[PDB]
Design an enzyme around this catalytic site. Structure first.
Site, PDB file in Angstrom:
ATOM      1  N   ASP A  90       0.834  -1.197   0.000  1.00  0.00           N
ATOM      2  CA  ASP A  90       0.000   0.000   0.000  1.00  0.00           C
ATOM      3  C   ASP A  90       0.870   1.250   0.000  1.00  0.00           C
ATOM      4  OD1 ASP A  90      -1.937   1.880   0.266  1.00  0.00           O
ATOM      5  OD2 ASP A  90      -2.494   1.350   2.318  1.00  0.00           O
TER       6      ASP A  90
ATOM      7  N   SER B  61      -0.556  15.493 -12.072  1.00  0.00           N
ATOM      8  CA  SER B  61      -0.806  15.143 -13.462  1.00  0.00           C
ATOM      9  C   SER B  61      -1.045  16.395 -14.289  1.00  0.00           C
ATOM     10  CB  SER B  61      -2.016  14.208 -13.573  1.00  0.00           C
ATOM     11  OG  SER B  61      -2.380  13.959 -14.921  1.00  0.00           O
TER      12      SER B  61
END
Ligand SMILES: c1cnc2c(c1)ccc1cccnc12
Length: 330
Positions: A35, A199
């Protein structure tokens, strides 16, 4: 040193991925959910409330000759999905795919919430976010990667998750045969303890690329792709019959649909998520309404590049002095 381990989807939907991890002496192998959105290595154990164990494999520290109780240490964590667990702490030898850390903090669960009990395939989590998020008290503990980093050939690990198929986590090296093209690196903020990046935009199917900054985290521990409501609405508007369902808790679409791809930007590069990766199957058994793999982050406070996005790429978690993230097509 290096390590290399195969990671496997837990079910037919790729809801999560498990990787075998060796703990203790003699080794006890548990299948853990790696994770990158958390920083605790915790396991179902012989200390876990019996009624909260339903098929998981347990770590029994009393059978490990290298286990030592970390005196006074406890841990308690709550995840974005509402699940939680807590317990005490041992140090022990932990190996992933040939790579060994002695003295790793292994957080033994005394309690787990219902969703963990109900998932027989996940024996615990191995956190790979930054150690500043580790919940051990009163002495915070380091992640497996943080403990291993100095010994590694290169201070990196890579996630190569498969779509409906096994994939690989590598520590200490970049497998240049595992991706196409080049790896594009992008800046990371560690201020919230996550692999947080920006992004450069997105496209829906064959549509025009929209340049727009989307701050989010690279999180192998979240199944879906959680993005701003404007982006998600633009995606689902391309799917006939798709709607946001308050009853179900997200965007749903007719199971008979063929979904468009979704492109996200990494600097000047582009990662294309094929449409099929966005289909998470019937909302309930036998339903013809299917759950979408791209959902709004509006009620989260952060965008999450979960498995839906990461499985479309070869992803480098670069733990150099200034951490960065790398993405390549594959
Ligand atoms: C992650 C999160 N929610 C889901 C899934 C995976 C898969 C199926 C599903 C069906 C209904 C509602 N949520 C989900």
């Amino acid at each position: 040193s290096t390590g290399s381990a195969t990671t496997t989807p837990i079910d037919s939907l790729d809801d999560a991925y498990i990787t075998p991890v060796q703990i203790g002496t003699p080794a006890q192998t548990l299948n853990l959910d790696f994770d990158t959105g958390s920083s605790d290595l915790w396991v179902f154990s012989s200390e876990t409330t019996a009624s909260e164990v339903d098929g998981q494999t347990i770590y029994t520290p009393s059978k490990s000759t290298t286990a030592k109780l970390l005196s006074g240490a406890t841990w308690s964590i709550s995840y974005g999905d509402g699940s939680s667990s807590s317990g005490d702490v041992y140090t022990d030898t932990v190996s992933v795919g040939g790579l060994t850390v002695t003295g790793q903090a292994v957080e033994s669960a005394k309690k787990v919430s219902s969703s963990f009990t109900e998932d027989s395939t996940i024996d615990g989590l191995l956190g790979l976010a930054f150690s500043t998020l580790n919940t051990v008290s009163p002495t915070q503990q380091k992640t497996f990667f943080d403990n291993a980093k100095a010994s590694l050939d290169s201070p990196v690990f890579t996630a190569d998750l498969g779509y409906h198929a096994p994939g690989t986590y590598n520590f200490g090296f970049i497998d240049t045969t595992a991706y196409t093209g080049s790896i594009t690196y992008t800046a990371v903020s560690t201020k919230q303890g996550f692999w947080e990046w920006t992004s450069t935009g997105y496209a829906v199917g064959s549509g025009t690329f929209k340049s727009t900054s989307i701050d989010g985290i690279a999180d192998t521990g979240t199944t879906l792709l959680y993005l701003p409501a404007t982006v998600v609405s633009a995606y689902w508007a391309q799917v006939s019959g798709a709607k946001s369902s308050s009853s179900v808790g997200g965007y749903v679409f007719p199971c008979s649909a063929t979904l468009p791809s979704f492109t996200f930007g990494v600097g000047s590069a582009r990662i294309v998520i094929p449409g099929d990766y966005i289909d998470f199957g019937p909302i309930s058994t036998g339903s013809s309404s299917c759950f979408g793999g791209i959902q709004s982050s509006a009620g989260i406070g952060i965008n999450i590049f979960g498995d839906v996005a990461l499985k479309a790429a070869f992803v480098v978690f670069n733990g150099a002095t200034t951490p960065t993230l790398g993405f390549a097509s594959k």
